[PDB]
Structures are given as structure tokens and as C-alpha cells.
Design an enzyme around this catalytic site. Structure first.
Site, PDB file in Angstrom:
ATOM      1  N   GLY A 154      13.041  41.530  47.955  1.00 14.43           N
ATOM      2  CA  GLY A 154      11.460  40.995  47.538  1.00 14.43           C
ATOM      3  C   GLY A 154      11.081  40.412  46.303  1.00 14.43           C
ATOM      4  O   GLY A 154      11.459  41.238  45.214  1.00 14.43           O
ATOM      5  N   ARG A 155      10.223  39.109  45.998  1.00 13.49           N
ATOM      6  CA  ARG A 155       9.425  39.272  44.518  1.00 13.49           C
ATOM      7  C   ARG A 155       8.351  38.324  44.756  1.00 13.49           C
ATOM      8  O   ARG A 155       8.319  37.938  45.850  1.00 13.49           O
ATOM      9  CB  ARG A 155      10.807  39.482  43.419  1.00 13.49           C
ATOM     10  N   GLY A 156       7.306  38.737  44.090  1.00 17.11           N
ATOM     11  CA  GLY A 156       6.181  37.556  43.932  1.00 17.11           C
ATOM     12  C   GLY A 156       6.149  37.732  42.375  1.00 17.11           C
ATOM     13  O   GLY A 156       6.626  38.758  40.894  1.00 17.11           O
ATOM     14  N   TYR A 207       2.942  40.009  41.464  1.00 18.73           N
ATOM     15  CA  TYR A 207       2.827  41.068  41.244  1.00 18.73           C
ATOM     16  C   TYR A 207       4.011  41.824  40.986  1.00 18.73           C
ATOM     17  O   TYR A 207       3.828  42.839  40.650  1.00 18.73           O
ATOM     18  CB  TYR A 207       1.351  40.844  41.913  1.00 18.73           C
ATOM     19  N   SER A 208       5.396  41.746  41.666  1.00 18.18           N
ATOM     20  CA  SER A 208       6.052  42.898  41.880  1.00 18.18           C
ATOM     21  C   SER A 208       6.889  42.468  42.084  1.00 18.18           C
ATOM     22  O   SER A 208       7.419  41.239  42.739  1.00 18.18           O
ATOM     23  CB  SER A 208       5.201  44.183  43.130  1.00 18.18           C
ATOM     24  N   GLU A 209       8.573  42.994  42.349  1.00 18.86           N
ATOM     25  CA  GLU A 209       9.339  42.877  43.143  1.00 18.86           C
ATOM     26  C   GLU A 209      10.244  44.218  43.456  1.00 18.86           C
ATOM     27  O   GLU A 209       9.610  44.847  43.832  1.00 18.86           O
ATOM     28  CB  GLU A 209      10.459  42.632  41.704  1.00 18.86           C
ATOM     29  N   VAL A 210      10.537  43.838  44.898  1.00 17.57           N
ATOM     30  CA  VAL A 210      10.818  44.901  45.416  1.00 17.57           C
ATOM     31  C   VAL A 210      12.177  45.323  45.920  1.00 17.57           C
ATOM     32  O   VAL A 210      13.109  44.007  45.950  1.00 17.57           O
ATOM     33  CB  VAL A 210      10.062  44.655  47.327  1.00 17.57           C
ATOM     34  N   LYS A 258       9.147  49.566  44.875  1.00 12.93           N
ATOM     35  CA  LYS A 258       8.264  48.243  45.605  1.00 12.93           C
ATOM     36  C   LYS A 258       8.011  48.342  42.934  1.00 12.93           C
ATOM     37  O   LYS A 258       6.852  49.172  43.336  1.00 12.93           O
ATOM     38  CB  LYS A 258       6.415  48.002  45.142  1.00 12.93           C
ATOM     39  N   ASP A 264      -5.528  39.184  51.694  1.00 18.69           N
ATOM     40  CA  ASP A 264      -3.727  38.085  51.896  1.00 18.69           C
ATOM     41  C   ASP A 264      -2.779  38.620  53.032  1.00 18.69           C
ATOM     42  O   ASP A 264      -1.762  38.910  52.828  1.00 18.69           O
ATOM     43  CB  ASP A 264      -3.058  39.010  50.605  1.00 18.69           C
TER      44      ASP A 264
HETATM   45  O1  LIG Z   1      10.038  47.372  54.328  1.00 23.21           O
HETATM   46  C1  LIG Z   1       9.199  46.783  53.352  1.00 23.21           C
HETATM   47  C2  LIG Z   1       8.492  47.003  52.902  1.00 23.21           C
HETATM   48  C3  LIG Z   1       8.019  46.354  51.760  1.00 23.21           C
HETATM   49  C4  LIG Z   1       6.577  46.483  50.752  1.00 23.21           C
HETATM   50  C5  LIG Z   1       6.155  48.038  50.524  1.00 23.21           C
HETATM   51  C6  LIG Z   1       4.634  47.464  50.035  1.00 23.21           C
HETATM   52  C7  LIG Z   1       4.800  47.046  49.913  1.00 23.21           C
HETATM   53  O2  LIG Z   1       2.746  47.102  48.913  1.00 23.21           O
HETATM   54  C8  LIG Z   1       4.875  45.293  48.896  1.00 23.21           C
HETATM   55  O3  LIG Z   1       4.619  44.690  48.637  1.00 23.21           O
HETATM   56  C9  LIG Z   1       6.041  45.347  49.949  1.00 23.21           C
HETATM   57  O4  LIG Z   1       8.702  45.320  51.847  1.00 23.21           O
HETATM   58  C10 LIG Z   1       9.824  44.781  52.149  1.00 23.21           C
HETATM   59  C11 LIG Z   1       9.724  42.941  51.954  1.00 23.21           C
HETATM   60  C12 LIG Z   1      11.093  43.110  52.675  1.00 23.21           C
HETATM   61  O5  LIG Z   1      11.779  41.748  51.700  1.00 23.21           O
HETATM   62  C13 LIG Z   1      12.090  43.957  52.903  1.00 23.21           C
HETATM   63  C14 LIG Z   1      11.160  44.454  53.894  1.00 23.21           C
HETATM   64  O6  LIG Z   1      12.211  45.581  54.490  1.00 23.21           O
HETATM   65  C15 LIG Z   1       9.959  44.871  53.167  1.00 23.21           C
END
Ligand SMILES: O=c1cc(-c2ccc(O)c(O)c2)oc2cc(O)cc(O)c12
Length: 326
Positions: free
Chosen positions: A40-42, A44-47, A62, A150
């Protein structure tokens, strides 16, 4: 304007609880956590799905993009305050790159299915179940003095096999203080409450109930996003074309707000469209009087009129979910 519930939470707690600027972060070991795959991404972050190399357990890394330290400490403080609450993502560690100091937040891993794929497969019962699970998280954070600000499907992780749900991305969340005027540039456009769209800054936890209402309408009507504005002016027009302008007018009058002339002109005049007008062959099996009654009680212009998360969980719509639990 003031919250009808949990207005004194931050008043009664020690300053250490809500004064996130005074937080000094305890940094863990960066090398404990290895990136396995981006998920994931946005803005403010990449995940990333990661691995804790000590115990070989999955985690989420994150990685935070450059932003003011104030915002980082706010998100860390809120996560620490809520850790262990029902269906709140668990912050496990906080680490940084030694050379660039870029921070990463380490969370429990949730084996998520994306909403665009998952939601169309959810039976009527599953929708009730997962919304109930999301309400538990919102009542909890509200009860702890925190607005998420959000709520949207992108921030609700669901491991469908385990029927586990977690409310994630607390990066826009804030502490509620009676009388405080907040920034209205929060939430994602399709989920912004009318308060945000007309510049009512003294909002509260009820903003999340609007956002939940939008998510819920999108699920039961299979129309995602339910209110599809191209910009913030258009978003209010899209709402007004469903709820009607008479209601908007009472609302504006109550809180002594006038629209920008351009905005007023764009909104125009619109009769209310009853909820059943959104039923079709695709969404029929999901739309019932109890669903409609619950939706109607969330999507109110006046944030003070919306159900609280605690009232929402008691609505007869969820009576089967509560019975399974009891
Ligand atoms: O387990 C997941 C946990 C998170 C996540 C957890 C805390 C955050 O503050 C955040 O911004 C994303 O994001 C994901 C994003 C995904 O696309 C898939 C996932 O499994 C997760």
C-alpha cells in the site's frame, strides 16, 4: 457546538494523555524488521508486509514520508493510547533509518482483502457483522477522546477468513477538546461530512458517523463511492441532491453559517430523494427497512442529530450480530 457524548474525556485525563507534542519517542531497532513486499501507499506513507526477524512473525512496516514532527508524534500518541482497544490496529514498534532519520511504524499484520474485491462478495449478514466490528472501534476511540477523521474502506483492514477487522491509519486522527476549532481539510473527499464542506470547524466524533454512513450506503446500494463529487464544492452538491436543500438550509441557519456565493449557486435547490430510489436488481438482497432506517439515522446534515457509535451498535439492524455474540 459540542459533542453529545465523551466531551469531558480529555478534560479529566492527565495532560500526558493528550499533550502529544510533549512525547519523547522510544526508538526500537530498525534491523528487527525486514520488508517482504509492498502492499500500500498514500500521500503520507508507504506500507509493506514485513517480517520481525527475532520471532519470524509477520508485521506491517509503515514508512512515513516527510512531514512535520508534530504530526508524527500525534499519530504515535493516539496509537499508544488506543493500543489494545477492540479492533484498533496494534502499534508494535517505532524505528528509524540512522542516516536519514526517516521513521517507520511497525504494526500487527492483518491478512487483508481489498474492499473493491471483498465487498461485492459480502452477504447481507457479513455487512452487518463487519459494520458492527467497525462500530466497536469507533465507540472505543470516541470513548478515549479521539476522532479518527478518515473513516473509509481503504482504512478498514479485514482478514475475512478469521472475521477480523482493524481500523488503520490514525495519521489524520485528533484529540477532541470542547470548543476547539479544527482543520476541515481531513477525511477523504467522498467521506467528508457536511461540517467539513461548509466550514464548521467546531466538529466532533460525529464526523466519523457521517463517514461510516457513506461507507455503509456504498455497501448496501453497491454504489462506491456513494457521494461522488469531483471536488469539495461538487461533494456538497452531490450530498444536497440526495438529502435535499430544505434540510441543508435548516442546518446552515442553526449553526449561523452562510455558504460562499459560488457554492450556494452550485448547490441550487433540490427535493429530498427517498432512500428506496437507490434500490435496483444488483442491491436488492442487501436493502431492507432496518438497513434504510439505520442509514437514515447516520446521514443527517446536523452532526448533533447523527447516532453516536454506541447507539448505532444497539440499532435493531445488528440484532442478529449481537445475538451471535451473546
Ligand atoms: O495489515 C495492514 C495494515 C496496514 C496499516 C496499518 C496501520 C496503518 O497506520 C496503516 O496506514 C496501514 O495497512 C495495510 C494495507 C494493505 O494494503 C494491506 C494490509 O494488510 C495492511
Amino acid at each position: 457546538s459540542k459533542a453529545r457524548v465523551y466531551a469531558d474525556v480529555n478534560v479529566l485525563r492527565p495532560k500526558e494523555y493528550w499533550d502529544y507534542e510533549a512525547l519523547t519517542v522510544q526508538w526500537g531497532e530498525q534491523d528487527d524488521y525486514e520488508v517482504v513486499r509492498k502492499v500500500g501507499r498514500g500521500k503520507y506513507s508507504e506500507v509493506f508486509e514485513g517480517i520481525n526477524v527475532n520471532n519470524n512473525e509477520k508485521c506491517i512496516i509503515k514508512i512515513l514520508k516527510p512531514v512535520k514532527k508534530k504530526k508524527i508524534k500525534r499519530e504515535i500518541k493516539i496509537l499508544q493510547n488506543l493500543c489494545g482497544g477492540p479492533n484498533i490496529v496494534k502499534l508494535l514498534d517505532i524505528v528509524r533509518d540512522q542516516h536519514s532519520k526517516t521513521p517507520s511504524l511497525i504494526f500487527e499484520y492483518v491478512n487483508n482483502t481489498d474492499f473493491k474485491v471483498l465487498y461485492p462478495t459480502l452477504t447481507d449478514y457479513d455487512i452487518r457483522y463487519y459494520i458492527y466490528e467497525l462500530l466497536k472501534a469507533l465507540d472505543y476511540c470516541h470513548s478515549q477522546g479521539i476522532m479518527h477523521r478518515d473513516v473509509k474502506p481503504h482504512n478498514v483492514m479485514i482478514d475475512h477468513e478469521l472475521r477480523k477487522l482493524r481500523l488503520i491509519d490514525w495519521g489524520l486522527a485528533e484529540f477532541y477538546h470542547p470548543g476547539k476549532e479544527y482543520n476541515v481539510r481531513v477525511a477523504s473527499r467522498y467521506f467528508k461530512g457536511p461540517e467539513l464542506l461548509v466550514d464548521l470547524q467546531d466538529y466532533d466524533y460525529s464526523l466519523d458517523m457521517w463517514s461510516l454512513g457513506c461507507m455503509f450506503a456504498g455497501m448496501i446500494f453497491r454504489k462506491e463511492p456513494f457521494f461522488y463529487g469531483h471536488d469539495n464544492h461538487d461533494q456538497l452538491v452531490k450530498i444536497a441532491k440526495v438529502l435535499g436543500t430544505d434540510g441543508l438550509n435548516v442546518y446552515l441557519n442553526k449553526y449561523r453559517i452562510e455558504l460562499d456565493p459560488q457554492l450556494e449557486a452550485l448547490v441550487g435547490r433540490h427535493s429530498r430523494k427517498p432512500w428506496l430510489k437507490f434500490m435496483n436488481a444488483d442491491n436488492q438482497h442487501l436493502v431492507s427497512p432496518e438497513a434504510i432506517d439505520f442509514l437514515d439515522k447516520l446521514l443527517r446534515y446536523d452532526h448533533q442529530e447523527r447516532l453516536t457509535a454506541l447507539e448505532a451498535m444497539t440499532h435493531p439492524y445488528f440484532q442478529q450480530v449481537r445475538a451471535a455474540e451473546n
